[PDB]
């Protein structure tokens, strides 16, 4: 839908991949963060409420984004993964690897993978008691 650039010239966007233990986000923006091209989630492809974080649902979401991003005029993507974050697992969810592999195999170029998990340097108290979750 524009960008008036040569078909051999790479136009870069940024894809933010949020993979928790309950859902998965595939969000594509421009090189800043103030313009959004498309956003699909794992829960927009399944019905069982227990497969929202499944690797299959992540793969289906990534395929929808590629179809839409081709129309917009985006050829390549920078990658930013994150887990839940501050008071949270800090461990990436099951759908992170599937989403990135699906993007590459759908016909998109990749560059500069990075991790952007919050990681406090000193935090507030987290959920549970001093005896933990039982």
């Amino acid at each position: 839908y524009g960008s008036s650039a040569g078909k051999d010239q790479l136009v870069y966007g940024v894809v933010h991949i949020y993979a928790s233990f309950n859902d998965t986000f595939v969000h594509v923006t421009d090189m800043s963060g103030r313009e959004t091209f498309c956003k699909v989630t794992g829960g927009m492809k399944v019905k069982a409420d227990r497969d929202e974080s499944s690797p299959y649902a992540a793969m289906m979401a990534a395929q929808d984004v590629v179809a839409r991003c081709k129309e917009c005029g985006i050829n390549a993507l920078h990658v930013k993964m994150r887990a839940t974050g501050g008071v949270g697992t800090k461990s990436p969810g099951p759908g992170a690897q599937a989403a990135l592999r699906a993007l590459a195999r759908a016909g998109m170029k990749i560059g500069r993978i990075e991790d952007v998990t919050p990681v406090p340097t000193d935090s507030t108290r987290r959920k549970g008691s001093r005896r933990g979750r039982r």
Binding site: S3, S4, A5, Y12, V119
Partner: protein
Amino acid sequence: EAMSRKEWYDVVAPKNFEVRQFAKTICNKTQGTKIAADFLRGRVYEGNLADLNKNEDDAYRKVKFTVQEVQGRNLLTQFHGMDMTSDRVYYLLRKWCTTIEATVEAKTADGYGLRLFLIAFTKKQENQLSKNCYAKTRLVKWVRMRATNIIRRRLAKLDINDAVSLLTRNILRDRLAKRCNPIIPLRDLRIRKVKVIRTPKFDAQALIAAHGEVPTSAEG
């Protein structure tokens, strides 16, 4: 349809970087009382130092630029800050040694205010056989003081463009390592992060000089 109202622009960096136009972006067109320039101004764009400046460890550095003027289909920017990327920082950490961190507040000659963060580690000698290389607290304080003075004096005489070149080409990093090693053996001294905390008021002439010749944009 959302894409039917969008227009494309080019983001161009100052002239102390080899690659001038390093990004593309979109914005809503002009309708009624809404003017696109009022929304484009103030955005913050991020780039990678390795892509901007050309095979070194610059692949882990990110530089941010804020938009200050709209020249047709071009966006003129200025330095906003830099950071180190977290995976690189975690890789430099080890056990059985001391980690030294310092925060330095400095100002340039054109009124910009900067805050800098440094990190360094103690190292074992080539023939050492002991189990650790922890440092005495007196030497740790001395390293912080000497590094603070060097940064303050070097930056107080430069404008924003020369100060950025000093930070992005590892001139200050090399000087700090040279003058701080005699206090205590150190490894992997880096400038972790730079924040811009003050900004002088806008000056069209100053921005024009900082950019020099501006490449043309094909959008339209």
